[PDB]
Design a protein around this nucleic acid. Structure first.
Ligand SMILES: NC[C@@H]1O[C@H](O[C@H]2[C@@H](O)[C@H](O[C@@H]3[C@@H](O)[C@H](N)C[C@H](N)[C@H]3O[C@H]3O[C@H](CO)[C@@H](O)[C@H](O)[C@H]3N)O[C@@H]2CO)[C@H](N)[C@@H](O)[C@@H]1O
Ligand SMILES: [Mg+2]
Ligand SMILES: [Mg+2]
Ligand SMILES: [Mg+2]
Ligand SMILES: [Mg+2]
Ligand SMILES: [Mg+2]
Ligand SMILES: [Mg+2]
Ligand SMILES: [Mg+2]
Ligand SMILES: [Mg+2]
Lengths: 154, 53, 121, 261
RNA sequence: AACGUGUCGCGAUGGAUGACUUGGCUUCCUAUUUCGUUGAAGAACGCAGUAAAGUGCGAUAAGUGGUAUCAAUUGCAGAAUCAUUC
RNA sequence: AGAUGUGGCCUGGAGGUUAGGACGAAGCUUAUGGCGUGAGCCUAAGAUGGACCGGCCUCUAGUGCAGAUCUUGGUUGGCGUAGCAAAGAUCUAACGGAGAUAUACUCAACAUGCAACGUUGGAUACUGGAGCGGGGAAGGAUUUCGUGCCAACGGCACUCGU
RNA sequence: GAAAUGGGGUGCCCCCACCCGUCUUGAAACACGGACCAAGGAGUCAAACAGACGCGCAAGGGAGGAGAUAUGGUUGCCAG
RNA sequence: GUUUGAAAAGCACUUUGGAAAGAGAGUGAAAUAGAACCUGAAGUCGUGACAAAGACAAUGGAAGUACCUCCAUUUCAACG
RNA sequence: CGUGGUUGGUGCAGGAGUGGCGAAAUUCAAGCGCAAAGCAAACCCGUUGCUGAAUACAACCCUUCAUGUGAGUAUUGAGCC
């Protein structure tokens, strides 16, 4: 009940989805929106390069006083980061989507990532202890990621 | 503005209604037709009990 | 049983909070018209091991023998009325005894004493 | 109700409103507001009392002159018809039958009476209108609603047994006629069937204009305010049209061409 | 350009509204209707093949006896007989 | 400010009447128009819903919200921000572990799998006998111990754990 | 198989236009209350008089309490 | 409120993952009824498609226009 | 000479109260998206007559191949209690 969009040709498109990821929403937002037009192998290349800290993830919406870096001129930004926990959870999802392409009978080297959508999951409640006897919230904010990818060849 | 009204004397200053703090002092006749029926039912049960006096 | 009264909330309480000797009378089925006409009794509480045929539901027109009167679930269990799960294993499907008429009675000399008590002749 | 807490106001000096608040701690209701019409778990505005005026008292003559007025309108077939009743095959209004129906002992015989006196078209109006009531009231022992069909007025309490089971036909006694049934809804003109000897004692019960009643002590029927209730025949009679003003020739009307002004 | 802004379609978060109601509240009635040293109310600890809480019961312990009922209980096991009593 | 009028609108229930509903009622949705000066009413479409309900006349009331430092629930900007800076400190190899040495080609490796965990050995420190030593009271009451195990908790982490 | 008038939607131009509620002689105020939404949220009920109006009877009016029997009936209707 | 459904028929099996889960199949009228599971609002958010747009904070009024419109109504021939 | 069941003991008979038990008749006939629907404008014609604007819909359009109506307490027609 979850996919906002459906593929054109569903017999040439493999889906993948995360139930409740427990990464930060505001970092898996930009980790995942950067691969929304990329092929599967160029999107996987980007994530192995964010881990090596050779390329960065551009923070374009939930940036808000992050440090500005020299590597965000690739994306036309000034500030971006290397969110390694949102990166490696998106690598588990690209590996699920290409396993779901092989059992459909499809070549995973021809898959363009159509449709990345990240939405907010239900938050999880903890507690921090402030001065003067106060107790105030310490929420988690996890996320929902979904993607298909449609084959574009010849 | 008070006008040409009668001087009231309404006599309700002694904690008569049951509010959240008062048990009340109040007597309602909602069982009036059921005690009306009870006394007649019990006079017909008694007129049998004494018969034929 | 006398469950139906003026007050719905009290009537609908005495139905769903009924003991199993009240649930036996409430879980009754009509008799077949070759059997209603013999004993001169119109309906009968369902026992185990008496044969019935189903009259409402997707299983209507299905005969069989009653294998469980599951009074806590308000249902009946016919062996021939069943389906299968995902495993391929078969499970008995419950029917309310309203949707069912009896075609053969299972008779003991306490059940033959109920028919002489409900005999309309 | 709503007042069974030990709540007190926290006063002023905290950034919270000045209302009573639940004492204690360690629970989710503690510190929550109490004792007002707007707090949850608090008490309603002006909580209802059992010494409200429930019952009303009506003057005895003004109850009698309302039973008479709803009973006069059952004789008018235009008002019985404009109130819902299907009296299109009925022999006469006021319908009057004989007293042989006060000895019927089978409901199948009472049903052939209504077919023969042609009052079965209003019993079959009530059977069709049987539905489940709309709203909350069907949880409150008011599940089904029907319409009010014909009333059957008996001379006394007997002979009802064939008629008690028919859904739609109402029974009555002429010695005790209810206005709740002679004009249900506030609307006059109930269709009434009127047995023979319940109709021959209706001058002893209510009297006439010049002769009082035996049952109701001192009650004559109230005098008509108008002798002839047809005030348009007066407006059109030849001795009222005689004294009217002569209708003069009025001015010639306008035209599509305007006026000089 | 990027951020942003707006509008629609689809998703999420949220848990309102409607429908439902084995509950409350209010009224009225019927009694061979009113506890305890013959140990009460209350409190404690236990009791099942499986059993935390609750319900029921008290080392005869989710009950023994008797009467009525007349083939269940059932989450899973177990169980003489498959039923004039036993 | 105030008074009043309204065959003026709206909500719950009751008495009557007149009708709707599994060929889809209430509810919800709106670039759904229509019409009323207006409160509002009504139609249409839901790729919504799944069983109740409308109109008119009367009767009745716990009957109309935008604000009361209003009540209760939820959400949101701030904001991936302030911060997580006392009590010196960790390093190494081998094992364990899903937690790696993770790459579509025509590529030798660096420049495309980072970080982080436990155990034993080794190195380096610290506490410094008014001890991050070994036992008791009060308080706690299974935190003790073995074995599995990682959802949530141990504000970072965990394969570890009170 | 479209044309035509409207209505709705989004921009644009020229023009006009101070933030709402509140106390106050006077608030756009450098005066209070005011982040968003849903759901609740405040002239009620009884008693005594009075006036207006509706209704019955009228030198009379009307109970109340209680009886009575349709009902000494009925699950109920019917506490009417 | 446990109110999934008429009935658990409570998703066998396949292959990705250490797993949570995912992609398919399957049951059922319905799975956008998949387990505190009917309806699923407002606020808030993501995404696809678009409309644009300087800095006059925004909203607002009037009057046109530009583009759009799962909307209404009317008209199609010796006729509106 | 009568009387007392409230003198005590022995007996026994009805009732009430209490608890079990105890009634009528269609699963009637039409089959499924579409007539298991309507019309004949008080009543009566009518136990009768003639009647299909879903040749449906499934989302930018047309075509090709597919899927799609849970249970009748509804509807209609007969018969009952
Ligand atoms: N997008 C604009 C907004 O639409 C909102 O309302 C929108 C939704 O509430 C509404 O919901 C749609 C419905 O149209 C559509 N036909 C079917 C769909 N099931 C609904 O969507 C709903 O269900 C899905 C999952 O089922 C949820 O993810 C979603 O949050 C929920 N809105 O569609 C409405 C628009 O047609 C607000 N009313 C309004 O504030 C605003 O206009
Ligand atoms: Mg108190
Ligand atoms: Mg309360
Ligand atoms: Mg009866
Ligand atoms: Mg109120
Ligand atoms: Mg630091
Ligand atoms: Mg040292
Ligand atoms: Mg932690
Ligand atoms: Mg002033």
């Amino acid at each position: 009940t979850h996919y906002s969009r459906k593929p054109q040709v569903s017999s040439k498109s493999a889906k993948a989805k995360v139930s409740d990821l427990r990464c930060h929403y505001k970092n898996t937002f930009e980790t995942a929106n950067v691969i929304n037009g990329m092929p599967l192998r160029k999107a996987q290349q980007l994530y192995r390069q964010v881990l090596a800290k050779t390329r960065c993830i551009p923070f374009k919406r939930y940036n808000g006083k992050i440090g500005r870096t020299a590597q965000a001129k690739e994306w036309g930004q000034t500030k971006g980061r290397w969110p390694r926990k949102s990166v490696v959870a998106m690598m588990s999802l690209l590996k699920n989507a290409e396993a779901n392409a092989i059992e459909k009978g499809l070549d995973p080297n021809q898959m363009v990532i159509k449709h990345v959508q990240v939405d907010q999951a239900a938050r999880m409640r903890r507690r921090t202890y402030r001065a003067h006897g106060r107790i105030t919230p310490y929420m988690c904010s996890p996320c929902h990621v979904q993607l298909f990818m449609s084959e574009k060849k010849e | 503005p008070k006008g040409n009204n009668a001087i009231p004397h309404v006599h309700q200053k002694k904690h008569w209604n049951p509010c959240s703090s008062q048990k009340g002092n109040v007597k309602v006749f909602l069982n009036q037709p059921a005690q009306k029926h009870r006394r007649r039912r019990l006079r017909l049960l008694k007129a049998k009990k004494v018969f034929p006096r | 049983a006398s469950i139906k009264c003026g007050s719905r909330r009290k009537a609908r309480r005495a139905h769903f909070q009924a003991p199993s000797h009240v649930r036996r009378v409430l879980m009754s089925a009509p008799l077949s018209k070759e059997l209603r006409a013999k004993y001169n009794v119109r309906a009968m509480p369902v026992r185990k091991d008496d044969e019935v045929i189903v009259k409402r539901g997707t299983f209507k027109g299905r005969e069989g023998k009653v294998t469980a009167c599951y009074r806590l679930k308000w249902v009946i269990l016919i062996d021939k009325v069943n389906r299968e799960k995902a495993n391929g294993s078969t499970v008995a499907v419950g029917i309310h005894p309203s949707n069912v008429e009896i075609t053969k009675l299972k008779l003991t000399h306490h059940r033959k004493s109920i028919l002489e008590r409900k005999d309309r002749s | 109700s709503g007042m069974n807490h030990s709540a007190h106001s926290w006063g002023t000096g905290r950034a919270v409103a000045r209302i009573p608040r639940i004492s204690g701690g360690g629970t989710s209701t503690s510190g929550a507001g109490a004792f007002g019409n707007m707090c949850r778990g608090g008490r309603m505005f002006a909580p209802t009392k059992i010494f409200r005026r429930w019952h009303r008292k009506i003057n005895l003559h003004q109850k009698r002159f309302a039973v008479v007025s709803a009973l006069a309108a059952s004789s008018v077939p235009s008002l019985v018809m404009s109130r819902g009743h299907r009296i299109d095959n009925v022999p006469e209004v006021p319908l009057v039958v004989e007293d042989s129906i006060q000895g019927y002992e089978k409901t199948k015989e009472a049903m052939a009476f209504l077919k023969a006196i042609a009052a079965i078209d209003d019993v079959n109006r009530v059977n069709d209108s049987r539905e489940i009531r709309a709203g909350r009231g069907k949880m409150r022992n008011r599940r089904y609603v029907a319409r009010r069909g014909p009333m059957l007025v008996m001379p006394n309490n007997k002979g009802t047994r064939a008629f008690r089971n028919i859904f739609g036909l109402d029974l009555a006694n002429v010695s005790a006629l209810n206005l709740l049934h002679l004009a249900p809804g506030g609307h006059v003109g109930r269709f009434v069937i009127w047995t023979k000897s319940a109709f021959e004692q209706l001058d002893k019960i209510f009297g006439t204009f010049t002769e009082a009643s035996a049952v109701k002590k001192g009650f004559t029927l109230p005098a008509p305010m108008l002798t002839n209730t047809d005030v348009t025949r007066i407006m059109q009679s030849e001795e009222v049209r005689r004294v009217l003003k002569p209708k003069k020739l009025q001015a010639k009307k306008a035209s599509r061409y305007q006026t000089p002004t």
